[PDB]
Amino acid sequence: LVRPKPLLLKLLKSVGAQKDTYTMKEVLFYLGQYIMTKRLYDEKQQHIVYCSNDLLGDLFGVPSFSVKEHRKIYTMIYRNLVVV
Amino acid sequence: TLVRPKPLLLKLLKSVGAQKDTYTMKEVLFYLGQYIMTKRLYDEKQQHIVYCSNDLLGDLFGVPSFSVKEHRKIYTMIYRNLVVV
Amino acid sequence: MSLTEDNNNTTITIAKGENKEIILHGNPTTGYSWVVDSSEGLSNTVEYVADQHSGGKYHIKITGTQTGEGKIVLVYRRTSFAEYWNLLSPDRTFTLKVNVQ
Amino acid sequence: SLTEDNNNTTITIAKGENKEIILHGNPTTGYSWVVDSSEGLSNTVEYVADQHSGGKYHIKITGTQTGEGKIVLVYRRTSFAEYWNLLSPDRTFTLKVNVQ
Ligand SMILES: [Cl-]
Ligand SMILES: [Cl-]
Ligand SMILES: [Cl-]
Ligand SMILES: [Cl-]
Ligand SMILES: [Cl-]
Ligand SMILES: [Cl-]
Ligand SMILES: [Cl-]
Numbered sequence: 461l462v463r464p465k466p467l468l469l470k471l472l473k474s475v476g477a478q479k480d481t482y483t484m485k486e487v488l489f490y491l492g493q494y495i496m497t498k499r500l501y502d503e504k505q506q507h508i509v510y511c512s513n514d515l516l517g518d519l520f521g522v523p524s525f526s527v528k529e530h531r532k533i534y535t536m537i538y539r540n541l542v543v544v
Numbered sequence: 545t546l547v548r549p550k551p552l553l554l555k556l557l558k559s560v561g562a563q564k565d566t567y568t569m570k571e572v573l574f575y576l577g578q579y580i581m582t583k584r585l586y587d588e589k590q591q592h593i594v595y596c597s598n599d600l601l602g603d604l605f606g607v608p609s610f611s612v613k614e615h616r617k618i619y620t621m622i623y624r625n626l627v628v629v
Numbered sequence: 630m631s632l633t634e635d636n637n638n639t640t641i642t643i644a645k646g647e648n649k650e651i652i653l654h655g656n657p658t659t660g661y662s663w664v665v666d667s668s669e670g671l672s673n674t675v676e677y678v679a680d681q682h683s684g685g686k687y688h689i690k691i692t693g694t695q696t697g698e699g700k701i702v703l704v705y706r707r708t709s710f711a712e713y714w715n716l717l718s719p720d721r722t723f724t725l726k727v728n729v730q
Numbered sequence: 731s732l733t734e735d736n737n738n739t740t741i742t743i744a745k746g747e748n749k750e751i752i753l754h755g756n757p758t759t760g761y762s763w764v765v766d767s768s769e770g771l772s773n774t775v776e777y778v779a780d781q782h783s784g785g786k787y788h789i790k791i792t793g794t795q796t797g798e799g800k801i802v803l804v805y806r807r808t809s810f811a812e813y814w815n816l817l818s819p820d821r822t823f824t825l826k827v828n829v830q
Pocket of ligand 2: 505
């Protein structure tokens, strides 16, 4: 069970999230919703997420990241929540 | 295969970022999928079931819900909502 | 006699043509089920059996069909909307039947 | 070698015999030919770019088990949803089985 920090919380809520406390599974779900809805992934290599002009970029602190790098993604997410 | 969506379907496609009046079928299917995903209209436990009775999608398909497994039914409902160019 | 969750990531020996049974608890009312992700050297059947006295058990019956080091991988999964929706647009497919003599 | 001409047909090889399937693809699009299933056969897949645009996928198969075998190849591009799903891995059960 985790508590998203304000910027991450704002992202999740922009795609339907209601609460303030989540499981990691839920956070990952809404993050996926967010990326898919704003179509941030590259068309030809769909593991590449471009976010340099998106709040997700500010949040993660990157211009882009690859979905293949699982540990990195978990790390970037963990930096932006408090483990309740 | 180029198509022109009728007004309800066009309103749906534009609500998820489409900006044209003419589309390929590939594009129509993509945006319709985006729409269902974004509004989470599908059932959580049986994710091929889409509930749309209180939705614009239900109006244009004329159903309370449908299953994504029924391919020919889906294509039929989509085809009734466009005209091929 | 039968393998269960505790036999995960182990090695067993069977005779070609011998049957063995894997039994795993599952709850398909959630939409998840046990399915064969991959196998080699084996044939199989999967059956759900409700607990008669939540959920039930998946019985995966395997049969050794080719001599050698075989393997079976099962996954407890639920098909996603994205997966169903993708199937409306089929990918180009090449199919070749091969009679091995 | 076999090509798209041989799609949806049946051939007969001997156990241990090799055959090559050659299919055009263009991985600069993100698509590639991948093996969907391969009963009775072992295989290798290699892409060779057209040096003279795309290129050719070489799928070498070998009869590894006497009987009615089959290979299915799909020209596909992994979707974002498929990548993202792997961040939440499904429970798996694995059993090595030495068949005698
Ligand atoms: Cl809460
Ligand atoms: Cl890649
Ligand atoms: Cl237009
Ligand atoms: Cl079902
Ligand atoms: Cl129907
Ligand atoms: Cl062992
Ligand atoms: Cl989707």
